[PDB]
Amino acid sequence: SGRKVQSGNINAAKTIADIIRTCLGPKSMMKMLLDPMGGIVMTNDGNAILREIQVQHPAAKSMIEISRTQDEEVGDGTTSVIILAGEMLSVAEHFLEQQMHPTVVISAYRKALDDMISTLKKISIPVDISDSDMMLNIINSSITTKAISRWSSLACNIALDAVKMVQFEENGRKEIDIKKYARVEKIPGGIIEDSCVLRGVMINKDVTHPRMRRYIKNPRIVLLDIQQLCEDIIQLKPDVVITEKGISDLAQHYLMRANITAIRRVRKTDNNRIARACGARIVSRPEELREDDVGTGAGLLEIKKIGDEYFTFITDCKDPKACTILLRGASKEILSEVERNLQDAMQVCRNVLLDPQLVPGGGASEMAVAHALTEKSKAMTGVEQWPYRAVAQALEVIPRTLIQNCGASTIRLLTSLRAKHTQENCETWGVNGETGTLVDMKELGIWEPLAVKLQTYKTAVETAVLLLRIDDIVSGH
Amino acid sequence: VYRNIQACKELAQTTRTAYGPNGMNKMVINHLEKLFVTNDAATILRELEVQHPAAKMIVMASHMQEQEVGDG
Amino acid sequence: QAALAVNISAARGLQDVLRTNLGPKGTMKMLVSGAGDIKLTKDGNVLLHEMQIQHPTASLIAKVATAQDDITGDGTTSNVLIIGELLKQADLYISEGLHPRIITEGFEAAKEKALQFLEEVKVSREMDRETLIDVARTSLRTKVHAELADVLTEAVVDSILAIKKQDEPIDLFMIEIMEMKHKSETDTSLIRGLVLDHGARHPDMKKRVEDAYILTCNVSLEYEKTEVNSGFFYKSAEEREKLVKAERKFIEDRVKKIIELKRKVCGDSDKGFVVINQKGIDPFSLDALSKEGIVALRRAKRRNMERLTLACGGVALNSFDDLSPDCLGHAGLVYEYTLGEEKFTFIEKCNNPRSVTLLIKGPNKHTLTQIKDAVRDGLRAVKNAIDDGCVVPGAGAVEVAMAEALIKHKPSVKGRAQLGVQAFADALLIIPKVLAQNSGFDLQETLVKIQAEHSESGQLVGVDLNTGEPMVAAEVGVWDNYCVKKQLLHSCTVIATNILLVDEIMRA
Amino acid sequence: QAALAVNISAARGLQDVLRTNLGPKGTMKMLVSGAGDIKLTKDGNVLLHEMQIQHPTASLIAKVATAQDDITGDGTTSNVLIIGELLKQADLYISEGLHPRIITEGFEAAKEKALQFLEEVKVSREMDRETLIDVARTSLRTKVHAELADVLTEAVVDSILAIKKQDEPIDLFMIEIMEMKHKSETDTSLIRGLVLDHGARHPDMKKRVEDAYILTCNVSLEYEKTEVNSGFFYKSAEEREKLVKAERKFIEDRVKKIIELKRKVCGDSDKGFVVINQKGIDPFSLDALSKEGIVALRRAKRRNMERLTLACGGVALNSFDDLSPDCLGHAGLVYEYTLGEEKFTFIEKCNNPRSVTLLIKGPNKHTLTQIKDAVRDGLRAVKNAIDDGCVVPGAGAVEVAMAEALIKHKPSVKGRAQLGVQAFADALLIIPKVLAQNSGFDLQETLVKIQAEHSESGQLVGVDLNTGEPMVAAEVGVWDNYCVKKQLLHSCTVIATNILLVDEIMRA
Numbered sequence A: 001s002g003r004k005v006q007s008g009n010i011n012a013a014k015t016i017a018d019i020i021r022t023c024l025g026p027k028s029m030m031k032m033l034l035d036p037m038g039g040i041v042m043t044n045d046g047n048a049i050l051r052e053i054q055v056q057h058p059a060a061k062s063m064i065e066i067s068r069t070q071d072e073e074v075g076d077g078t079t080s081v082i083i084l085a086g087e088m089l090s091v092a093e094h095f096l097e098q099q100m101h102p103t104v105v106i107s108a109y110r111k112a113l114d115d116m117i118s119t120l121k122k123i124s125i126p127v128d129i130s131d132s133d134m135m136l137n138i139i140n141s142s143i144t145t146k147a148i149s150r151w152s153s154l155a156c157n158i159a160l161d162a163v164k165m166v167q168f169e170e171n172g173r174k175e176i177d178i179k180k181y182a183r184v185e186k187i188p189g190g191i192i193e194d195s196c197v198l199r200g201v202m203i204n205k206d207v208t209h210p211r212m213r214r215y216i217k218n219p220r221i222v223l224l225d226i227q228q229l230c231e232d233i234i235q236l237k238p239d240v241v242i243t244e245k246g247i248s249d250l251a252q253h254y255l256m257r258a259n260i261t262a263i264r265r266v267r268k269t270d271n272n273r274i275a276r277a278c279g280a281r282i283v284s285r286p287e288e289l290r291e292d293d294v295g296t297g298a299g300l301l302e303i304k305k306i307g308d309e310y311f312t313f314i315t316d317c318k319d320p321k322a323c324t325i326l327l328r329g330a331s332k333e334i335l336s337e338v339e340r341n342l343q344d345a346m347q348v349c350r351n352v353l354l355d356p357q358l359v360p361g362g363g364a365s366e367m368a369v370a371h372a373l374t375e376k377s378k379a380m381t382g383v384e385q386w387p388y389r390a391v392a393q394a395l396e397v398i399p400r401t402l403i404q405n406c407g408a409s410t411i412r413l414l415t416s417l418r419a420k421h422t423q424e425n426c427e428t429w430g431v432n433g434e435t436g437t438l439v440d441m442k443e444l445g446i447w448e449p450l451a452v453k454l455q456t457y458k459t460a461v462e463t464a465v466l467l468l469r470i471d472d473i474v475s476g477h
Numbered sequence B: 001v002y003r004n005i006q007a008c009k010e011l012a013q014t015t016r017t018a019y020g021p022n023g024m025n026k027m028v029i030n031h032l033e034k035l036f037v038t039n040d041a042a043t044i045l046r047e048l049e050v051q052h053p054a055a056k057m058i059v060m061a062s063h064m065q066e067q068e069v070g071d072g
Numbered sequence C, D: 001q002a003a004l005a006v007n008i009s010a011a012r013g014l015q016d017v018l019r020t021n022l023g024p025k026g027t028m029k030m031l032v033s034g035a036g037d038i039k040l041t042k043d044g045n046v047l048l049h050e051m052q053i054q055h056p057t058a059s060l061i062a063k064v065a066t067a068q069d070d071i072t073g074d075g076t077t078s079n080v081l082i083i084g085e086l087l088k089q090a091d092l093y094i095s096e097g098l099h100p101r102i103i104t105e106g107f108e109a110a111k112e113k114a115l116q117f118l119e120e121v122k123v124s125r126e127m128d129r130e131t132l133i134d135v136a137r138t139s140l141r142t143k144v145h146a147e148l149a150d151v152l153t154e155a156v157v158d159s160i161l162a163i164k165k166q167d168e169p170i171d172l173f174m175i176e177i178m179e180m181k182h183k184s185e186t187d188t189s190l191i192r193g194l195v196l197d198h199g200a201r202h203p204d205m206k207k208r209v210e211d212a213y214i215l216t217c218n219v220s221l222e223y224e225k226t227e228v229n230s231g232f233f234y235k236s237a238e239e240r241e242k243l244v245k246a247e248r249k250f251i252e253d254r255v256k257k258i259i260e261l262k263r264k265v266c267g268d269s270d271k272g273f274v275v276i277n278q279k280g281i282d283p284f285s286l287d288a289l290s291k292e293g294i295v296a297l298r299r300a301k302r303r304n305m306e307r308l309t310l311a312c313g314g315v316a317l318n319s320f321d322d323l324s325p326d327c328l329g330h331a332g333l334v335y336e337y338t339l340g341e342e343k344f345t346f347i348e349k350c351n352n353p354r355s356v357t358l359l360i361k362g363p364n365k366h367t368l369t370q371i372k373d374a375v376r377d378g379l380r381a382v383k384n385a386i387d388d389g390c391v392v393p394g395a396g397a398v399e400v401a402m403a404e405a406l407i408k409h410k411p412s413v414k415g416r417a418q419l420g421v422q423a424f425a426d427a428l429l430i431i432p433k434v435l436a437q438n439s440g441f442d443l444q445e446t447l448v449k450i451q452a453e454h455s456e457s458g459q460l461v462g463v464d465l466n467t468g469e470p471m472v473a474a475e476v477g478v479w480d481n482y483c484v485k486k487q488l489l490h491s492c493t494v495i496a497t498n499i500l501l502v503d504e505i506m507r508a
């Protein structure tokens, strides 16, 4: 008990923090995993190693879960958060031992994070939206250095359409976006260049017997889950109705009498995207029937069979919020990277809409913010200033690991970077990740999204305060 | 080199609490097993027969300090 | 810090185990199983696929090496030796710092330089019979005895030059290796067309078939009955007593269909109607139809019938009747040959005689397997040499010149990558060393002699595995495959980088 | 058969222990005694005399190294490092058989080539004060604190320049070093001529006397007309009374001779003759001598008479009855210095402008011994530098040049002796590597830069131990001694081949 419980938590934190501290950057070392049967796997990804490793300490499990949940939130940076949290806890080691209560440490950390947000918002160089040249520069900065080096054009065009087919002007100006309503079709076959984008959702399922009309100039898609409903649909007579019940031949002719084209054996994964693309409303209760039963769906439909399989083509939708990004190629070994890259690009577009900025990469932003806090701390007073300086100093962990997994000596390079950076007023000099040499990031063309940086710093600070707030762990074993 | 640093750190920590007017007293048992109470750092260190050579260096440096300053 | 040392030790152990296999004069290992049956082999691929490895990462190395080099012909043991030497050389610099990334950069630069060197050294002498003889000898003397290899080279080279007429390398079906157990292992030749495993119960039906027509179509002289009714013969056995009957009408239907097929497309008892069944047949209908001149047999595997489709012709459906004879083809000779007690049907001189099978007469199982593997390796090597069209001087000729080029390429690269390049050169130097050591001569005596004479020779030069004298492999007949060298270098660099980039190991 | 692995591992461990000592920024080592005495040192000349050495052959290496260093005494650590690296490189090739004798032949060839190459990179100029300043700095910064060397180099160069007689070299006893127990180091000065070990501090002693003379007496108050000293025979009646009057007259009988001897030279002892006694003197005779300026002292060591024989002139024979004026030695300017407790006789302008004494001053011996050893071996190095007419570049500049010369001499050698010379050249690179390691910079990176610079430029580029950068090493005045390097080249080779030729250690 006493300090020993917090010490155990933060030691378990530091261990899993520095187990993979080398695994980031463009020259990441590859880690070695063996299960107790002789099976061998060679891994270069922090998420994979943290998933496969088994640890029992509750603090380690909590931080692993924090990293895992932050993975889907933002994507990139999933390891920098762990490294930052571990380094901050390792520097809080020295203040926990000298008998100061965790409350002042939490207060100092919160003040430091408040300064963090403003400093990041200050130094971030602005970037425009949808302009091809620096967008492709961003693609080179983040998407490249992976297995899509020779196929970056397809990822570029898919991202460029994707950032424009999921726009949500719900409560503001397009600031809302989603990454799950895109009708992605990862079908193996043919050259990888066969991928294309089609406006509007499309469905892998269609009518079993195509002796019937599907495409109409005004598709009024209506969602639905006994012929009573079939001839009660005549309340407005929508041309096409999407349901989840089987249709017989006599039932199909009943649909024709009802001027509807129903579908069968279609999962919710298609139904929700259909609803998003067409913007309709679902109603089946007889009392709930009103003038709002039917909402106009897409603007066109087409019948076409691609790759010897029956599809449904909902093209030119009323709302271009759920469109289709077709993808054909050899296999899926290239397209998962395409998926994560387009997710990152959509996040970049979304934040540029939110805050059109790109903080310098390669530790330049880290150096800028550390310099800002270490110069601001000199004025403010109180014993709380020691953690305020400690967090800024420990934030230097990204450049040191970048230089470490490059061959160059971290100490001399770090000293040269900081000493140069202080005299420099608005330079934001960083370190080359491939050669371990000092270089201005605007020259090297490397940049980082602002939203992901804010999320990483805020999540790291929140994890630090969460793991330092815990006063005991005993509830059993 | 860390062992020498640990030895010097422990030696300094032993007599750190005696600093200033508010120094704790010490129970000093000499070689001939005699009770002795004091708080002076020089008295206990001159009685402390430490073994680590780094401790020997730091203590003899302190002795040279006392030689021409008389305190501190 | 120490995981790297563990991986280094495992790789060195694997290399040391596989040291005494490279080269025709190198000794061969033998494999023992839990059952008791043993295998005697020297090829690296089978050795790595069959060895029971202790160390985990050594098993990783073996598995990944086999997986990658299955694409090319061979060079497995050479690849393992080179990766082990690369790891050792990198360790001699890592032990004093030298972060592995710099060694990786040096390795990649050396790989690029070696690729360019191999591109500019490869010799594009036009293909002929003699070069194929030399390639077959070089690829065969490293898997079997000397004179056995010399005998087998003629057979394999003749088969391959026969195949080469399509102007496109194809394999698998078109070349078939038959296995049998005659005492005289010296008998080894090639047979055009197809050779069927065995036949049926026919007393001197046709024998010398001469011209023949092939329809096969899985005849139903013993068409399946209705035996299965409920489990087995119960007290209600009248089903399996009478319903099992009345299916003889299917057999008679097939008999008559073949009857008008034969006396429609032939018009006489000659011109053997070649048909096959996937299962057994009744001798009664079989010999009744064969006495009319119909070549009917039984109990054949699928691979032969798919080869018959492309080399003899005729559709094949188990459920069938008389139909269009358009699919039917012609055969020059369907003579049947019997050696002692088991019958071989020689379906040769047929339409599209491109398909050819290889005949061996190994005495026992393990010699048969070794002969099969050796001939397969020779076929793959000569096919690759055909495909590239540019053979390369073997016997360590390319390796020593590559090492010299890498050394002369040292000042070109900046930084500390020169150490990686030098280690890469010293590792690629291992192949002539292993050749000399396995032959029996002194390691550095032969190495120094070869390097000293290559210094002024300019042309490539190897090692004679009979006296230790340097030898110009180009003028003697030692040859390797361009694709083999390409894949070996690339995979070697990849695996060396992957192992060197490891930092720490934890359980899972 | 290969039982030399234990010897080579012991040599490698010894090299590791003596590592991190070269260069001015080397790591000092502390020696603990059994009784608890602590000694701080860095020079291998004394560091190879530890309380324990553990492994036997490691002790043998130390024995031979400290036996062969005494000619020069400047490269013991360098020699041990070179031996460790030579053995390791030879092991890299002995692992694969390769009987050691050919390696010894290669070592002999490399030694011949290196000694031949030594004759050109050396530079031979005239040496004067500013040139010897660099030599003293280089030979002193490696054995003492950096700041202290700054004041000691200037204090030693002037001394050695002033005491250089002619082309004939110096004598070991020609230079004498004295110390004291001053609390503060207070730099270090220089005194010409003899310095008294200890004297009589009677208040009537004379300090400032010019044109003095010296005589040495053995005993003057114990035995009458006899130079023997022993306990008084109390039991003997005649002896007791005879020695009691000998307490009074045995001094005065020759005191009158002394006073007339000095007064005939100068009235009333104007020149102020000085006398020294082996033991104490009668207080009454002490006062009588001090009144005339004779200055009676005591505690004359057995070497002072010989030292002043060549310095103060005359003969300081202990036999009495001087009579003739021939045993007295002129003292041009005798000054009595009594710093703190001990009084010292500074005989300036004696009958020698040579045989100076140093005034090294500092705290308790824990570091004063290090200071005296540093000044001693600096004096040895400057003596050798002024003896030979040539000097060589330091900072490992010469080592890289020898490495390149040996590498370019590789084809001229025949057989595996080429590999021997290659191993020797590769082992010669240890000096720049250990210098870079001790300075804290990257080991291989510094040597890479140095070799890259030296490749294009014939200048012997060296290492600067403050930035890890190549440096010309000529104008910086980093020169090291030449004879030390020449002897080291032989002394490393002999021990290397001797250890490499051993076999089958026996328990005699």
Ligand SMILES: Nc1ncnc2c1ncn2[C@@H]1O[C@H](COP(=O)(O)OP(=O)(O)O)[C@@H](O)[C@H]1O
Residues within 6 Å of the ligand: A023, A024, A025, A026, A075, A076, A077, A078, A079, A080, A360, A361, A362, A363, A431, A432, A433, A434, A446, A448
């Ligand atoms: N080529 C490069 N040069 C310099 N810095 C880089 C380079 N590539 C990535 N980085 C830096 O590495 C940091 C981590 O990014 P990365 O390792 O790609 O993903 P993760 O953060 O998920 O580990 C980024 O902040 C970026 O600034």
Ligand SMILES: Nc1ncnc2c1ncn2[C@@H]1O[C@H](COP(=O)(O)OP(=O)(O)O)[C@@H](O)[C@H]1O
Residues within 6 Å of the ligand: B018, B019, B020, B021, B023, B071, B072
């Ligand atoms: N009344 C006081 N208030 C604050 N500090 C004091 C007071 N008296 C003495 N000191 C401090 O105590 C220090 C010396 O105490 P101590 O270490 O016990 O003995 P020494 O004088 O041998 O060092 C001095 O540096 C002085 O600043």
Ligand SMILES: Nc1ncnc2c1ncn2[C@@H]1O[C@H](COP(=O)(O)OP(=O)(O)O)[C@@H](O)[C@H]1O
Residues within 6 Å of the ligand: C021, C022, C023, C024, C043, C044, C045, C074, C075, C076, C077, C078, C138, C139, C141, C142, C394, C395, C396, C435, C462, C463, C464, C465, C478, C480
């Ligand atoms: N007659 C020969 N003389 C010298 N070297 C030969 C001869 N035959 C083959 N070799 C060498 O053997 C090597 C291939 O042997 P090995 O690597 O053991 O077989 P695999 O390719 O199945 O691994 C080739 O590089 C070739 O240089």
Ligand SMILES: Nc1ncnc2c1ncn2[C@@H]1O[C@H](COP(=O)(O)OP(=O)(O)O)[C@@H](O)[C@H]1O
Residues within 6 Å of the ligand: D021, D022, D023, D024, D042, D043, D044, D045, D073, D074, D075, D076, D077, D078, D079, D137, D138, D139, D141, D142, D394, D395, D396, D431, D463, D464, D465, D478, D480
């Ligand atoms: N200022 C300097 N800069 C670089 N190297 C120096 C300097 N002074 C001395 N050295 C190096 O110190 C070495 C000699 O020290 P060393 O041989 O280790 O003495 P010992 O062997 O007696 O301990 C020389 O090789 C020289 O290169």
